[PDB]
Design a protein around this nucleic acid. Structure first.
Ligand SMILES: Nc1ccn([C@H]2C[C@H](O)[C@@H](COP(=O)(O)OP(=O)(O)OP(=O)(O)O)O2)c(=O)n1
Ligand SMILES: *P(=O)(O)OC[C@@H]1CC[C@H](n2ccc(N)nc2=O)O1
Ligand SMILES: [Mg+2]
Ligand SMILES: [Mg+2]
Length: 342
DNA sequence: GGGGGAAGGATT
DNA sequence: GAATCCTTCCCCC
């Protein structure tokens, strides 16, 4: 089994770059402006020029403008990015039908039946980068290894516009030396608590009693890390669809008033049914964000499809429940749709 | 005993 | 901040 993983370089910022020639060699920061106070919101993506001075995804915009005030700041245009992404993934499909589109900026190809060894895979990867650059002017990084996780790790390593093979000797070395925080699917909440116990490398995961590990990070992550350190991670490359679509918006202050909150909620529904195409969800969640970092939701699932008009009524009810079962005022309001037909 | 569903939590 | 996916828990056949 040979896996070829493809990840798009600083993707939202790079698409803005391709579109706007007046930008490339400068620092570029793609943001989501919550539209509240001036410069309210966060950084979604920054190019490498911007990253050098500390500005990266998830930091507050006002923070990015202190450590790098003169950069070019741009609002997120997710639909533009999604159009480009869709085109590149159709390019990817041509190299393998065994493809796992994991997110808007990355995918896994099972190229086992296509190539006989890592040398041929590396040439294939080069051909893939070349065609994506040619057709879309977008640089990508390719990872190649024996399974999905290590192929991504290879891409993580290959910096931007790179390509890298992690062979079998290399996985063994990586199991012992790679930081747990560098493992796909392991975020900082998980990395930090493990690190306090001295669990810093994948191999350490074997040194700790399974039951303690499961009590810390949960059964799934435990087994996941353990399977990695044991060099027996399986999981084939399979077709993936987006499971949920939704809209969450920030309100201009506001509070508890129903008829005040309702107009935002309604817009989020419009946008969510817009983005759903002709998918048809069976479940709906209304999500509100309180006056703190507190996120509260209420949902309902039906034995059938939810018509858009029906989305309206149910979503108000769900909101009524949130308002009734929580005293804090509401800052942001949204809706998520899931459990689609087929 | 194991879906399924709901509510909260974590990752990108 | 926004979008999405993951984790835990409850209940009933
Ligand atoms: N706190 C965070 C972390 C990440 N993201 C988004 C930004 C990224 O565009 C996207 C995917 O993460 P990537 O690490 O792949 O980021 P980039 O594609 O922008 O750059 P790179 O390819 O170097 O990873 O997740 C976000 O919105 N908020
Ligand atoms: P990123 O570094 O570009 O990685 C994206 C991947 C796609 C799926 C997966 N993912 C997404 C969202 C959540 N909550 N959990 C995940 O594991 O990361
Ligand atoms: Mg990327
Ligand atoms: Mg990515």
């Amino acid at each position: 089994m040979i896996v070829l993983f493809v990840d798009f370089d600083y993707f939202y910022a790079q698409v803005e770059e391709v579109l706007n020639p007046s930008l490339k060699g400068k620092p570029v920061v793609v943001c989501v402006f919550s539209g509240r106070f001036e410069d309210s919101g966060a950084v979604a993506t920054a190019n490498y020029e911007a990253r050098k001075f500390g500005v990266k995804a998830g930091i507050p915009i006002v923070e990015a403008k202190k450590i790098l005030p003169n950069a070019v700041y741009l609002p997120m245009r997710k639909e533009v990015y999604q159009q480009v992404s869709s085109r590149i993934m159709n390019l990817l499909r041509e190299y393998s039908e065994k493809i796992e589109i994991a997110s808007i900026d990355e995918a896994y190809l099972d190229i086992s039946d296509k190539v006989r060894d890592y040398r041929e895979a590396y040439n294939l990867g080069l051909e893939i980068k070349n065609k994506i650059l040619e057709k879309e002017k977008i640089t990508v990084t390719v990872g190649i290894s024996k399974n999905k996780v290590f192929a991504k790790i290879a891409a993580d390593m290959a910096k931007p516009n790179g390509i890298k093979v992690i062979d079998d000797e290399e996985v063994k070395r990586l199991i012992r030396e790679l930081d747990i925080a560098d493992v796909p699917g392991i975020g900082n909440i998980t990395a930090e608590k493990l690190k306090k116990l001295g669990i810093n490398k994948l191999v350490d995961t074997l040194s700790i009693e399974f039951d303690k590990l499961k009590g810390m990070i949960g059964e799934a992550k435990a087994k996941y890390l353990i399977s990695l350190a044991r060099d027996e991670y399986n999981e084939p490359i399979r077709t993936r669809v987006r499971k949920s679509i939704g809209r969450i918006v920030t309100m201009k202050r506001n509070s508890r008033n129903l008829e005040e909150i309702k107009p935002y909620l309604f817009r989020a529904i419009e946008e969510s049914y817009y983005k759903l195409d002709k998918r048809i969800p069976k479940a709906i969640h209304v999500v509100a964000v309180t006056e703190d970092l507190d996120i509260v939701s209420r949902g309902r699932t039906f034995p059938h499809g939810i018509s858009k008009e029906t989305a309206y009524s149910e979503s108000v009810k769900l909101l009524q429940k949130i308002l009734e079962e929580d005293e804090r005022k509401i800052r942001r309001i949204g809706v998520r749709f899931s459990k689609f037909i087929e």
